[PDB]
Amino acid sequence: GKRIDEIESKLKHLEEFTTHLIKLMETMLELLKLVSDGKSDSEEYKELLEKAEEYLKQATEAAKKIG
Amino acid sequence: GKRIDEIESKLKHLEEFTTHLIKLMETMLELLKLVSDGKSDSEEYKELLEKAEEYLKQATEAAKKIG
Amino acid sequence: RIDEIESKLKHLEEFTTHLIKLMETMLELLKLVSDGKSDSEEYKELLEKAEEYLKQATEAAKKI
Protein backbone atom coordinates (compact mmCIF):
# COMPACT_ATOMS: atom_id res chain seq x y z
CA GLY A 1 0.00 0.00 0.00
CA LYS A 2 2.06 2.90 -1.32
CA ARG A 3 -0.78 5.38 -0.79
CA ILE A 4 -1.09 4.01 2.75
CA ASP A 5 2.61 4.73 3.34
CA GLU A 6 2.17 8.27 2.01
CA ILE A 7 -0.75 8.83 4.40
CA GLU A 8 1.29 7.37 7.27
CA SER A 9 4.18 9.75 6.57
CA LYS A 10 1.85 12.76 6.41
CA LEU A 11 0.27 11.71 9.71
CA LYS A 12 3.70 11.33 11.32
CA HIS A 13 4.63 14.86 10.26
CA LEU A 14 1.26 16.16 11.49
CA GLU A 15 1.93 14.46 14.83
CA GLU A 16 5.29 16.16 15.37
CA PHE A 17 3.75 19.43 14.15
CA THR A 18 0.98 19.18 16.75
CA THR A 19 3.58 18.39 19.42
CA HIS A 20 5.55 21.57 18.75
CA LEU A 21 2.23 23.41 18.43
CA ILE A 22 1.10 22.32 21.91
CA LYS A 23 4.43 23.47 23.34
CA LEU A 24 3.99 26.84 21.60
CA MET A 25 0.43 27.12 22.95
CA GLU A 26 1.53 26.53 26.54
CA THR A 27 4.28 29.10 26.04
CA MET A 28 1.87 31.73 24.70
CA LEU A 29 -0.57 31.09 27.54
CA GLU A 30 2.23 31.59 30.07
CA LEU A 31 3.22 34.80 28.28
CA LEU A 32 -0.36 36.07 28.54
CA LYS A 33 -0.35 35.16 32.24
CA LEU A 34 2.83 37.20 32.75
CA VAL A 35 1.16 40.10 30.93
CA SER A 36 -1.77 39.75 33.35
CA ASP A 37 0.46 39.81 36.43
CA GLY A 38 2.11 42.98 35.09
CA LYS A 39 5.59 41.69 34.15
CA SER A 40 5.22 42.65 30.50
CA ASP A 41 8.94 43.56 30.42
CA SER A 42 11.00 41.04 32.40
CA GLU A 43 13.57 38.30 31.84
CA GLU A 44 10.82 35.67 32.08
CA TYR A 45 8.97 37.31 29.20
CA LYS A 46 12.13 37.41 27.06
CA GLU A 47 12.93 33.75 27.72
CA LEU A 48 9.35 32.70 26.99
CA LEU A 49 9.39 34.80 23.81
CA GLU A 50 12.55 33.12 22.51
CA LYS A 51 11.13 29.72 23.46
CA ALA A 52 7.89 30.48 21.60
CA GLU A 53 9.90 31.56 18.55
CA GLU A 54 11.93 28.34 18.51
CA TYR A 55 8.74 26.30 18.97
CA LEU A 56 7.17 28.16 16.04
CA LYS A 57 10.21 27.46 13.85
CA GLN A 58 10.12 23.77 14.81
CA ALA A 59 6.39 23.52 14.05
CA THR A 60 6.95 25.35 10.75
CA GLU A 61 9.55 22.78 9.72
CA ALA A 62 7.26 19.94 10.82
CA ALA A 63 4.36 21.34 8.78
CA LYS A 64 6.71 21.84 5.82
CA LYS A 65 7.63 18.15 5.98
CA ILE A 66 3.99 17.30 5.21
CA GLY A 67 4.41 19.00 1.83
CA GLY B 1 -5.61 -6.14 10.81
CA LYS B 2 -7.04 -2.60 10.82
CA ARG B 3 -4.63 -0.07 9.30
CA ILE B 4 -7.00 2.36 7.59
CA ASP B 5 -9.17 2.32 10.72
CA GLU B 6 -6.21 3.54 12.78
CA ILE B 7 -5.63 6.22 10.14
CA GLU B 8 -9.27 7.30 10.46
CA SER B 9 -8.97 7.44 14.25
CA LYS B 10 -5.90 9.68 13.93
CA LEU B 11 -7.79 11.96 11.53
CA LYS B 12 -10.84 12.18 13.82
CA HIS B 13 -8.69 13.07 16.82
CA LEU B 14 -6.93 15.68 14.68
CA GLU B 15 -10.32 17.15 13.75
CA GLU B 16 -11.22 17.52 17.43
CA PHE B 17 -7.74 18.96 18.02
CA THR B 18 -8.27 21.62 15.34
CA THR B 19 -11.69 22.51 16.77
CA HIS B 20 -10.30 23.13 20.26
CA LEU B 21 -7.33 24.89 18.65
CA ILE B 22 -9.57 27.38 16.86
CA LYS B 23 -11.49 28.06 20.07
CA LEU B 24 -8.15 28.66 21.81
CA MET B 25 -6.94 31.02 19.08
CA GLU B 26 -10.15 33.06 19.29
CA THR B 27 -9.65 33.31 23.05
CA MET B 28 -6.03 34.41 22.59
CA LEU B 29 -6.96 37.04 20.00
CA GLU B 30 -9.60 38.54 22.30
CA LEU B 31 -7.03 38.52 25.12
CA LEU B 32 -4.59 40.49 22.98
CA LYS B 33 -7.36 42.91 22.00
CA LEU B 34 -8.00 43.50 25.71
CA VAL B 35 -4.25 44.02 26.17
CA SER B 36 -4.34 46.68 23.44
CA ASP B 37 -7.22 48.34 25.30
CA GLY B 38 -5.36 48.19 28.62
CA LYS B 39 -7.68 45.62 30.27
CA SER B 40 -4.73 43.33 31.07
CA ASP B 41 -5.81 43.28 34.75
CA SER B 42 -9.61 43.28 34.37
CA GLU B 43 -12.02 40.46 35.20
CA GLU B 44 -12.76 39.82 31.52
CA TYR B 45 -9.05 39.05 31.16
CA LYS B 46 -9.27 36.48 33.96
CA GLU B 47 -12.32 34.79 32.44
CA LEU B 48 -10.64 34.67 29.04
CA LEU B 49 -7.50 33.19 30.62
CA GLU B 50 -9.60 30.49 32.28
CA LYS B 51 -11.35 29.69 29.00
CA ALA B 52 -8.02 29.58 27.17
CA GLU B 53 -6.65 27.15 29.76
CA GLU B 54 -9.74 24.97 29.26
CA TYR B 55 -9.30 24.97 25.48
CA LEU B 56 -5.60 24.19 25.91
CA LYS B 57 -6.42 21.19 28.12
CA GLN B 58 -9.00 19.89 25.64
CA ALA B 59 -6.57 20.30 22.74
CA THR B 60 -3.85 18.57 24.76
CA GLU B 61 -5.98 15.52 25.52
CA ALA B 62 -7.33 15.38 21.96
CA ALA B 63 -3.75 15.33 20.63
CA LYS B 64 -2.68 12.81 23.28
CA LYS B 65 -5.38 10.42 22.06
CA ILE B 66 -3.44 10.08 18.78
CA GLY B 67 -0.76 7.72 20.10
CA ARG C 1 -11.99 5.64 1.46
CA ILE C 2 -8.39 6.51 0.58
CA ASP C 3 -9.52 9.49 -1.52
CA GLU C 4 -11.48 10.80 1.47
CA ILE C 5 -8.42 10.48 3.71
CA GLU C 6 -6.31 12.28 1.11
CA SER C 7 -8.82 15.14 0.90
CA LYS C 8 -8.77 15.34 4.70
CA LEU C 9 -4.97 15.56 4.63
CA LYS C 10 -5.10 18.33 2.01
CA HIS C 11 -7.50 20.35 4.16
CA LEU C 12 -5.26 19.75 7.18
CA GLU C 13 -2.28 21.05 5.18
CA GLU C 14 -4.17 24.24 4.32
CA PHE C 15 -5.04 24.49 8.01
CA THR C 16 -1.36 24.17 8.96
CA THR C 17 -0.40 26.93 6.52
CA HIS C 18 -2.98 29.40 7.84
CA LEU C 19 -2.03 28.31 11.36
CA ILE C 20 1.65 29.10 10.81
CA LYS C 21 0.66 32.54 9.52
CA LEU C 22 -1.52 33.14 12.59
CA MET C 23 1.21 31.94 14.95
CA GLU C 24 3.79 34.28 13.41
CA THR C 25 1.32 37.17 13.73
CA MET C 26 0.56 36.32 17.36
CA LEU C 27 4.24 36.04 18.29
CA GLU C 28 4.94 39.39 16.64
CA LEU C 29 2.03 40.83 18.63
CA LEU C 30 3.52 39.40 21.83
CA LYS C 31 6.84 41.00 20.90
CA LEU C 32 5.02 44.32 20.48
CA VAL C 33 3.56 43.68 23.94
CA SER C 34 7.15 43.69 25.16
CA ASP C 35 9.07 46.99 24.97
CA GLY C 36 5.74 48.76 25.59
CA LYS C 37 4.05 48.98 22.18
CA SER C 38 0.60 47.71 23.18
CA ASP C 39 -1.04 50.83 21.70
CA SER C 40 0.91 51.28 18.45
CA GLU C 41 -0.63 51.07 14.99
CA GLU C 42 1.52 48.01 14.28
CA TYR C 43 -0.46 46.25 17.02
CA LYS C 44 -3.71 47.25 15.31
CA GLU C 45 -2.74 46.05 11.83
CA LEU C 46 -1.35 42.87 13.39
CA LEU C 47 -4.70 42.28 15.09
CA GLU C 48 -6.37 42.73 11.70
CA LYS C 49 -4.00 40.24 10.04
CA ALA C 50 -4.57 37.83 12.94
CA GLU C 51 -8.35 38.03 12.48
CA GLU C 52 -7.86 37.31 8.77
CA TYR C 53 -5.63 34.30 9.46
CA LEU C 54 -8.13 33.06 12.06
CA LYS C 55 -11.08 33.19 9.67
CA GLN C 56 -8.95 31.44 7.03
CA ALA C 57 -8.11 28.68 9.51
CA THR C 58 -11.81 28.29 10.34
CA GLU C 59 -12.72 27.98 6.65
CA ALA C 60 -9.93 25.43 6.20
CA ALA C 61 -11.07 23.39 9.22
CA LYS C 62 -14.70 23.34 8.04
CA LYS C 63 -13.56 21.41 4.94
CA ILE C 64 -12.31 18.51 7.09
Residue numbers in the entry:
A (entry chain B), B (entry chain C): 3 to 69
C (entry chain A): 5 to 68
Sentences from the paper on this structure:
Here we use deep network hallucination to generate a wide range of symmetric protein homo-oligomers given only a specification of the number of protomers and the protomer length. Starting from only a choice of chain length L and oligomer valency N (2 for a dimer, 3 for a trimer, etc.), the method carries out a Monte Carlo search in sequence space starting from a random sequence. To eliminate such over-fitting, we generated new sequences for the HAL backbones using the recently developed ProteinMPNN sequence design neural network (accompanying manuscript: Dauparas et al.).
To evaluate design accuracy we attempted crystallization of 19 designs and succeeded in solving crystal structures for seven (three C2s, two C3s and two C4s). All crystal structures had the correct oligomerization state and closely matched the design models (median Cα RMSD of 0.6 Å across all designs, with resolutions ranging from 1.8 to 3.4 Å). The side chain conformations in the crystal structures also closely match those of the design models.
